[PDB]
């Protein structure tokens, strides 16, 4: 159906996302069990990590477009990522390495993430109709990798240990790099402008220097989440002031605040919803025993099933409003499952978590996938920067919100943890329903301003 480089990009993206989600799925449990963090420390540390992973994505588009070229930056990102995974594996011998290792994944992801999609859009003549379907298949690539990693990495880490899990993340990046090198012949005339001049060693060295400095800055911020909190607070207040000094822009600002709320909620899947599954859900579905950490795989699962359907089925403000209502219902469903449908022992049916993740995945399909592509219609570089900044702030806020469900290590009774989860998830659901309603109320004004 598609050009030959499409299949290359599809499989490279699949394997890189497999490595990343291999780490994401096990990381909070690794903090608690392997490093002995309390749940509170593990949740805010995960929030800082994810804030860096997501905020740094802006660097890689610039580096790919203007310094080194898209294809060279794919190679460099994949190598830094692989090194970061093998470093995380080595942190089990050398525990003092963990934060440097996570910084290396973050910087690596920052260099890599934007560039495969950019490459993909250059595989098609400019207004080729196959573009939409190819980008839907690209999203599905990401979620197939995510589904495999979130399903299997917890099982692997339990049977064989963490060093093996992280080294297989490493190995996934290595085979992504092998697939890319084997298929390089396919993209020889595809690239950004620096891809076709000789490589500038001055700029390559500047990129390496900046990368290493950022690896160390990330490590520091993740080890001291309070200064990271204040850094993002002053950066947000300040970038907000410089945005409020300099109509279709105000629309992008309200849509950004709504994206912020969405990502606060998305941040709960590896933290508070993960430990909710661990503590208060039956670990058996359809007669099979599973690792409860694997329940995270229900998000890519429902995306893979639902992204065809929803691709084959107002406009932007209403699509955002709908996504927000779906997220609200996901959390209200978790709360209702805990308030009314639990066993005498304090455990709930896994079908309720299946439904929670369905709602959350639908919200994802309506919001995060459809976000910056019609913020790219409302608009540039400053706004893209601020977009990733507020996304990072959302992950930091999400880690802080997760701490309200944190369980002390000595609690062993599910009837003690169930009400903590149900109070926090119920209040999240109600706040998010309120926000969805105010969004609905503002949809006509927003549509008129877009016009």
């Amino acid at each position: 159906q598609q050009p030959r480089p499409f299949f290359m990009i599809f499989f490279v993206e699949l394997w890189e996302r497999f490595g990343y989600y291999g780490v994401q799925g096990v990381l909070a449990v690794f903090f608690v069990k392997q490093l002995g963090f309390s749940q509170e420390q593990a949740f805010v540390t995960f929030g800082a990590f994810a804030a860096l992973v997501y905020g740094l994505i802006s660097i890689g588009g610039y580096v790919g477009d203007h310094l080194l070229g898209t294809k060279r930056t794919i190679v460099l990102g994949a190598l830094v990522l692989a090194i970061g995974y093998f470093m995380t594996g080595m942190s089990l011998l050398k525990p003092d390495l963990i934060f440097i290792a996570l910084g290396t994944i973050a910087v690596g992801n920052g260099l890599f993430k934007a560039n495969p999609a950019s490459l993909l859009s250059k595989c098609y003549p400019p207004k080729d109709p196959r573009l939409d379907g190819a980008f839907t298949l690209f999203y599905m690539s990401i979620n197939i990798g995510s589904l495999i990693a979130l399903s299997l990495a917890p099982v692997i880490a339990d049977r064989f240990g963490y060093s093996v899990t992280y080294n297989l993340c490493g190995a996934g990046l290595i085979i992504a790099l092998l697939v890319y090198i084997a298929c390089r012949g396919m993209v020889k005339d595809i690239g950004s402008e620096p891809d076709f001049r000789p490589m500038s060693f001055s700029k390559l060295l500047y990129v390496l220097l900046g990368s290493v400095v950022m690896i160390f800055v990330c490590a520091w911020l993740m080890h001291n989440v309070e200064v990271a909190n204040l850094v993002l607070i002053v950066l947000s207040i300040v970038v907000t002031i410089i945005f409020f000094r300099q109509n279709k822009m105000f629309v992008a600002f309200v849509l950004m605040l709504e994206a912020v709320v969405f990502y606060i909620l998305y941040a709960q899947m590896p933290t508070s919803l993960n430990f909710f599954a661990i503590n208060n859900v039956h670990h058996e579905i359809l007669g099979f025993s599973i690792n409860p950490v694997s329940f995270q795989a229900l998000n890519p699962f429902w995306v893979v099933l639902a992204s065809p359907i929803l691709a084959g089925i107002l406009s932007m403000p209403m699509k955002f409003t709908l996504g927000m209502f779906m997220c609200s219902l996901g959390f209200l469903t978790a709360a209702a499952a805990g308030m009314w449908f639990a066993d005498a022992q304090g455990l709930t049916s896994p079908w309720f978590i299946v439904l929670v993740y369905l709602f959350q995945s639908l919200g994802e399909l309506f919001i995060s996938a459809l976000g910056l592509a019609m913020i790219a219609a409302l608009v540039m570089g400053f706004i893209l920067g601020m977009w990733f900044l507020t996304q990072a702030a959302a992950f930091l806020l999400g880690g802080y919100v997760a701490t309200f469900t944190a369980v002390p290590d000595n609690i062993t009774d599910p009837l003690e943890t169930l009400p903590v989860y149900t109070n926090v998830f119920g209040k999240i659901g109600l706040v998010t329903l309120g926000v969805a309603v105010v969004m609905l109320l503002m949809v006509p004004w927003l549509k008129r301003m877009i016009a």
């Epitope: 608690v32 069990k33 339990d158 049977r159 240990g161 661990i278 503590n279 208060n280 039956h282 670990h283 058996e284 025993s289 690792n291 409860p292 950490v293 066993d343 005498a344 022992q345 304090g346 455990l347 369980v407 290590d409 000595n410 609690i411 062993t412 009774d413 599910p414 943890t417």
Partner: nanobody, 122 residues
């Protein structure tokens, strides 16, 4: 995923026994291990357990007599039973649940040992 219990047997009132539970491929260290017991003519009931981070839970009638503990190097969980009484007679099972929770009922646990007979004689 398969637990092996050892240590049962026959003892007189006021004596002591020590059960042990070991797992095979999965590392028991990620698991809360609960000890259940079934006396003749009754249901499996929760006796004692340790979660994955040293939290402990006990049935009221064994407090101050039984101690659960964990050797994370040998990957073993132990149940030390002192001041045994005749009504402690039962088949004892270890059960494993991923995480920090020790639910009271057998359905909260997916992995089960085969059971060891403990008999306490007057």
């Amino acid at each position: 995923v398969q637990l092996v219990e050892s240590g049962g047997g026959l003892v007189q009132a006021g004596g002591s026994l020590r059960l042990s539970c070991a797992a095979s491929g999965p590392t028991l260290s990620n698991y809360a291990v609960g000890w259940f017991r079934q006396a003749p003519g009754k249901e499996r009931e929760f006796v004692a357990g340790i979660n994955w981070s040293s939290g402990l839970r006990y049935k009221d009638v064994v407090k101050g007599r039984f101690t659960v503990s964990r050797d994370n190097v040998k990957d073993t969980v132990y149940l030390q039973m002192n001041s045994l009484k005749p009504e402690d007679t039962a088949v004892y099972y270890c059960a494993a649940r991923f995480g920090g929770m020790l639910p009271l009922q057998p359905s909260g646990y997916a992995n089960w040992g085969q059971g060891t007979q403990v008999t306490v004689s007057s």
